[model samples]
Target: PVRKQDTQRALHLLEEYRSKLSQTEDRQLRSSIERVINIFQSNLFQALIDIQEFYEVTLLDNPKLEVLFQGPGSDTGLYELLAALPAQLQPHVDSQEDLTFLWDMFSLHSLVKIHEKLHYYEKQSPVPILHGAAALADDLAEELQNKPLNSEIRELLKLLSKPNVKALLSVHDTVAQKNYDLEVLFQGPALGEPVRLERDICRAIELLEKLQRSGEVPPQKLQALQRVLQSEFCNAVREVYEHVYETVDIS
Candidate 1:
C-alpha cells in the first residue's frame, strides 16, 4: 500500500527527528531518548520472558533441552542476538575494570556454549569470546603494576594470553558437548544441572581473589565484578530458556 515516494518521506522525517534529538542538550531531549530506549528494552525483555515460560513448559514434557542445541538453524537466532549485544551496550558502558572482566567472562561463556552447539551440529566455528579475555587481563595487569602481582594471578593471565588456552578451551567445549549428549542419552536433563554452575562460579571467584591478591582488583573493581557477575548470571540463565523455547514448541 505504500509507494517509494512515501517511504522516502518517512525516511526524511526520521532523519530530521534524529538530527533534532542529537542537537538538543535539554532535559526533554534526554527524557525522549530514555523513553525510546526503555520501550525498546522493555519489548525485548517481555519477549525473552515469554520465551522462557514456553521453554519451561516444553522441558516439562520432553525433560531435556539438548534437542534445541543439536542443529544449526535451531540456534542461529540466539547466537545472532547475543553477538549483537556487545556492540549495542558498548556505547553506554563505562570502564569499571573488574566488572568489565566479569562481562568478558560471561561473554566468553556464552560464546563457548554457542561454539559447542555449532560443533555438535557440525557448523563452522567463529572466533570464540575468550580471545578478548586477554585485553581484560592486560588491563588488570596494568592495574597490578603499581602493586604486587600474585603468582596465581600472573599464571592465570599468562594462561589467558597464550594460544594454549584456546586448546584448553577446546577441551571444555568437548566437555560441554558431552554434557549435552549425556542429557539427551540418559533422558535425565543435565541442562539444569547445578554442579557445573557452581563450579563456574567458584572458578570466577578464585580468579577474582587472585586478582585481588595481585592488587589488580581494587574496591571499585570488586564492585564492578560483583555487579556484572550478578547481572550476567541472570541474563545467561534467561538465555538458556529463551533458546530452548524459540527452537521447540511448548504448547
Candidate 2:
C-alpha cells in the first residue's frame, strides 16, 4: 500500500548505477547511466511523496492533519470520528509531523504537528506508551542538532550509515519490547501522560534551539541529548508503523 517495495527498488537501482559508474570509462555509457541515475533519484523522491499521500488520504475517515495536530477536543472532530471507526482503522493514521512536513516541509511546523498529534492520540488511544516513544524521538533529534560527536549518538549515526534505524528498531527485541510497552501504556490511562510527553519533547527542542542561538553545546550534554533524540526517533517511527498495523487493514 505504501509502495515500500518500489522505494527499495529505486534505491537498489541507484546503487547499481553508482557501482557501474565506478567501472565504466566509456563516456557515452557513463552519460546514459547518469541519466538513468537521475531517473532513479527522481523516482525515489516521487515514491516518498506517493507514500506520504497514501497515508494522508487512506489512513483515516475525517483525515485532517491540521485537526490532528490541533490536539484533542479542540473542536477538530477528528479523534471522536476516528474513535467511531473500527479499531482496524487506527494504524492507518499518519503522524502529525509526517503530515505537516509533507504539507509544509518546515521543521518547526513539523514539531508543532508532532506535539499536537501526540496530544490528540494520547487521549483517543494510548498515552504513556505514545508519549514515551515521542520522548525518545525528541531526545534523539535534539542530540543530532546539538552534539555531532557524542559517543553513543556517534555510534548510532555510524550504525545508521550502515543500516536503517527503522529496520533495526522494528526487529530488535529490546526496541520492540519498549515499543510494545509504550503502546500498552498509551492504550490505557497512565501517569505522566501524553501532555507531559508533549512537554518533554518540546522542551528538548527548545534546548536545541537555545544551543543553536548560543552556537555552542557541551560535548557531554550533547551526547545525552542525542541519546534521547535517537531513542525518540526510533520509537516514534515504530509507533506510527505499529499503530497503523494494529488499527488498519493495509495488507
Candidate 3:
C-alpha cells in the first residue's frame, strides 16, 4: 500500500488506542497521550495533504486548469454585496474594508475543510512501520561477536555498531521495505540525506501547523456540523456568491 494509506491506518489504531485509554480515570494519562497523538496526527495529516497536493500539481492532467483563472473578471461576490448593502446596514458593517470579515469567515471555512480532509486521510492511512535496525543490530551484533574476529572483522563490526551506520542501514531497509514510520516519513531523512520539500509546500505546512495549534475542534462533532452546513441551499449560495461579482455591475 501507499505511504498515505499506511499512515491513515496507523491513525485509526491511534484513535482506538486513545478511546481505550480514555476509560482510565487518570487525567494526566489521557491528556499526555492526547497531546502526543495530536502532534503526531497533525504532522501526519500535513504530510499527506502536502503529498496529495504535490501529486495533483505535478502529474494531474487538467489542461484548462491555468486558463480557468486567467482573466480578472472573476471574484467572490463579497465586495459587491458589501458595496450594494442598504445604507441602514452600513453602520453595522464595521470597517472601511467593507465586510472583509465575511470573506475572512469564508476563507476560514475552506481552511477548516482542508483541515478536515487532512485528518480524514490521516485516519485512513495504515499503521506506520517502526524501524527494525535496532533489533537488526542486536541480532547481528551477537551473531557476529561469537564468530572468530580479526582486526578487519572487529573494525567492521565496530563500524556497524555506530549509530550513523545503523541509521543508514535502517533507512536503506526503510525505503527498500516501504516501512516509513512517522519520523522518517516527514520530519527529516533517516541519516544525512536531504528531503526535498517544495518552498510553497513548506509554507503551506507551516500555516497548517499554526492553524492546528490555534484551534481546538473535535473531528467527530465537526463531521456532523459539516454535514448540516453543506446542504443544497449552501451550494446554491456558494455558486451565487462566487460569481455575483462578475455578473453584477456596481460601477
Best by lDDT: 1
User: Among these predicted structures, which one has the highest TM-score?
Assistant: 1
Model 3 stretches with alpha carbons more than 4 Å out:
1-137, 185-190, 193-251
Of candidates 2 and 1, the better by lDDT? 1
Give the TM-scores of the predictions, in the order they appear.
0.27, 0.22, 0.26
Report the C-alpha lDDT of model 1 over 53-117, residue by residue, as the tens digit: 33433334444555545555454444443344334434444546522532342222232333445
Instruction: Write the candidate numbers in order of decreasing TM-score.
Output: 1, 3, 2
Quantify all predictions' global Cα lDDT against the true fold: 0.39, 0.39, 0.37
lDDT of 2: 0.39
Residues 1-251, model 2: lDDT tens digits? 33434434544543443454444453644454344335335422343234344533332442434444543435443333222322222233245533332232112223223334454554343222223333343455565646566444444444332323323332333333433333332222221233443444444445544544455543444444334444544345345554444333333
lDDT of 3 by residue, 1-251 (tens): 12344335434543443465445452644454454346446643444334333333211232322332223322322233323322323344455553343232212122223344434433443332223434544554565466566443365456555443444445434533544464543322222221211222233234323323444321222222222223233223223222322322211
lDDT of 1: 0.39
